[PDB]
Structure 1
Amino acid sequence: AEQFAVGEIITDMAAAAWKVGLPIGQFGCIYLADMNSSESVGSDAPCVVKVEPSDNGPLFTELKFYQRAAKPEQIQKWIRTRKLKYLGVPKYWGSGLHDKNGKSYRFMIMDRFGSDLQKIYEANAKRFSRKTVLQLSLRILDILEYIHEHEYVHGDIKASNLLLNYKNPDQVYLVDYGLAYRYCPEGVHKAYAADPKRCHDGTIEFTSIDAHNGVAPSRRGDLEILGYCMIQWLTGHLPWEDNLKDPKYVRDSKIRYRENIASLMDKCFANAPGEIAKYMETVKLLDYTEKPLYENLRDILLQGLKAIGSKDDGKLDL
């Protein structure tokens, strides 16, 4: 199905006009997009349009997240109060309803990014430096604190969901909120239980123990997912990576390694970077409904940067 005629002008719900260009990268139904003008949408376009049938659940979930939490000025306000260089939550530009060939579709206009981190990781023989991992993780902690404080949990952090700013290789953004989860609607935390609405478990190698136990994701699970990403990034591996077809094996391993983090460090690393063990110990202390002390997690990571004779200079080193 072609959802658009290439070069057509589409008008969103706020009457802003956009033009549609070609598909990106040979992701889903995602096309380059720009402000309506007399020029064609070029390969250096600054936006994308994501389009799915209107009965698609994930696009609707994602749209709601972006409308509630990613409004250009909502993000800018947070950046000013927190004295952040930037925030890696993509900006929402608009959305609408588009009918074609008697089918109804939903569309959403978003920032356009450069490469995902997974491609860059594979081009570096599946390693990121200690400097890179700490700098990424600091910015992901900023992002997670933001979304959590706006009642959502991502539940699927991974290098393929981390995109670089098209104009700035040192700024990383977390994308894909189609299976994001509003753990705290109206300040009321979800109970330790399954959500019948939700069916997703994250990505098996990175997902949280809570997710493996069949309960809805919460804040600690996001921090836990980031922990496993860090190890994967530093080492090229996770202990359970050859048994991903067997979830109960993966859960058993995660549960045992949480109970004994020094054995995780022994398995994954001779000498391990101490911030990682410290990070995971702090995450382990969290109850299901407990608010993380994000600034203490960031501190733990800053002490890793000090230990390699560096600082938080915002350099990803990719």
Structure 2
Amino acid sequence: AEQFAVGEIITDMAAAAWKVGLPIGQGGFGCIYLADMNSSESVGSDAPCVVKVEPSDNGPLFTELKFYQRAAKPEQIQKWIRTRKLKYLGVPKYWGSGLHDKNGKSYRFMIMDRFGSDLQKIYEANAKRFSRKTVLQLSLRILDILEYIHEHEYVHGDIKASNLLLNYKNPDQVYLVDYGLAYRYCPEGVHKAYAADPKRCHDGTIEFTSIDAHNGVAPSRRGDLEILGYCMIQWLTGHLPWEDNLKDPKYVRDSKIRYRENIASLMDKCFPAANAPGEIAKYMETVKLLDYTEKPLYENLRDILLQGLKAIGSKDDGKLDL
């Protein structure tokens, strides 16, 4: 059911005018089309925006829109980039939203930045390996993103390569996308208790998700950091220990619990020899020390990863090396 007439002009709630182009990536990512500001030109394949459109009763698009309106306004993002002295911040820019009726059904739409490739495609094209340099540079920037969203009351719960996209015009800038299943863990500064939330039915991506999520509790900050830990190992080695049993969540949980209790055994399992990168172990030990409601020391985590860069004769020069 086509939601748009190709080339139509749509007006968001702030009265800004946009033009709709063709769907992205051969329709493999659902109802997301290229978009640009209204003009006499039609929308090309190098369009700088996309429009996401879903039925108005779609829960995830509403959640995602509230995240962007609350936490990702220009002033908030630019103020943070300035005050933290960052090169950039990988939270996608939200441009506008509205309601669109068609054929007697009601839809919601959101205009966002258009990106280049996801990291999963690049990872697979590299025979499922990223270099130590790449993984550390990706993870430093993801720590910047997580600190930002955490400080604005949200956790992501689903960090992975397919949710990490490159700036269309700059392959050294990575962005974390998909807030449809994001969770507001700290509304108005009050942390959610350590329990299930009936409103939330999402457990994340089984191979990467947190022990908290496996235990049926709502995601919190430590969980996001834990997810990133599992990603780092997957990216460095091509594997995780529990990957042959992902249809059995009890098995996945059991194995994560055991490897959290004995991080040296995780390093032995995942890396050759006594050839584990020490920063990965230290990262995981530091995350292990976090209580459910505890604020992470994000700078201490970044410093741990920076020691990895010094160990390989490099520095944080922002080069992803993809």
TM-score band w.r.t. shorter chain:
over 0.9
Deviation, structure 1 residue 277: 0.1
1:9 counterpart residue number = 9
1:274 counterpart residue number = 278
Task: Report the Cα distance in structure 1 between the residues aligned to 2:111 and 2:321, rounded to whole angstroms.
Answer: 30
Task: Report the Cα distance in structure 2 between the residues aligned to 1:122 and 1:12, rounded to whole angstroms.
Answer: 38
Deviation, structure 1 residue 28: 1.7
Q: Deviations over 1:241-265 (max 9, x none)?
A: 0000000000000000000000000
RMSD (Å) for aligned C-alpha atoms: 0.4
Task: Report the Cα distance in structure 2 between the residues aligned to 1:74 and 1:167, rounded to whole angstroms.
Answer: 23
Task: Report the Cα distance in structure 2 between the residues aligned to 1:38 and 1:69, rounded to whole angstroms.
Answer: 33
Deviation, structure 1 residue 237: 0.1
Q: Deviations over 1:36-71 (max 9, x none)?
A: 000000100000000000000000000000000111
Deviation, structure 1 residue 188: 0.1
2:85 counterpart residue number = 83
Deviation, structure 1 residue 73: 2.3
1:314 counterpart residue number = 318
Task: Report the Cα distance in structure 2 between the residues aligned to 1:85 and 1:201, rounded to whole angstroms.
Answer: 33
Q: Deviations over 1:62-95 (max 9, x none)?
A: 0000000111221111100000000000000000
How many residue pairs match? The answer is: 318
List gaps (5 residues or longer) in structure 1: none
Task: Report the Cα distance in structure 1 between the residues aligned to 2:43 and 2:67, rounded to whole angstroms.
Answer: 27
| Alignment partner of 1:226 out of 225, 228, 241 | 228
Partner-residue secondary structure (3-state), 2:36? strand
List gaps (5 residues or longer) in structure 2: none
Task: Report the Cα distance in structure 2 between the residues aligned to 1:28 and 1:194, rounded to whole angstroms.
Answer: 30
Task: Report the Cα distance in structure 1 between the residues aligned to 2:97 and 2:224, rounded to whole angstroms.
Answer: 28
TM-score, scaled to structure 2: 0.98
Task: Report the Cα distance in structure 1 between the residues aligned to 2:34 and 2:169, rounded to whole angstroms.
Answer: 16
- Give matches, 1:117-266, under 5 Å: 117-266=119-268
Q: Deviations over 1:155-213 (max 9, x none)?
A: 00000000000000000000000000000000000000000000000000000000000
Task: Report the Cα distance in structure 2 between the residues aligned to 1:138 and 1:249, rounded to whole angstroms.
Answer: 30
Q: Deviations over 1:265-314 (max 9, x none)?
A: 00000310000000000000000000000000000000000000000000
Task: Report the Cα distance in structure 1 between the residues aligned to 2:14 and 2:36, rounded to whole angstroms.
Answer: 16
Task: Report the Cα distance in structure 1 between the residues aligned to 2:142 and 2:30, rounded to whole angstroms.
Answer: 24
TM-score, scaled to structure 1: 1.00
Task: Report the Cα distance in structure 1 between the residues aligned to 2:146 and 2:67, rounded to whole angstroms.
Answer: 14
Task: Report the Cα distance in structure 2 between the residues aligned to 1:72 and 1:36, rounded to whole angstroms.
Answer: 21
Task: Report the Cα distance in structure 1 between the residues aligned to 2:43 and 2:292, rounded to whole angstroms.
Answer: 46
Q: Deviations over 1:129-152 (max 9, x none)?
A: 000000000000000000000000
Task: Report the Cα distance in structure 2 between the residues aligned to 1:76 and 1:21, rounded to whole angstroms.
Answer: 29
Partner-residue secondary structure (3-state), 2:243? coil
Moved over 3 A (4+): none
Task: Report the Cα distance in structure 1 between the residues aligned to 2:5 and 2:84, rounded to whole angstroms.
Answer: 43
| Identity across matched positions, percent | 100
Partner-residue secondary structure (3-state), 1:287? coil
Deviation, structure 1 residue 127: 0.1
Task: Report the Cα distance in structure 2 between the residues aligned to 1:63 and 1:23, rounded to whole angstroms.
Answer: 20
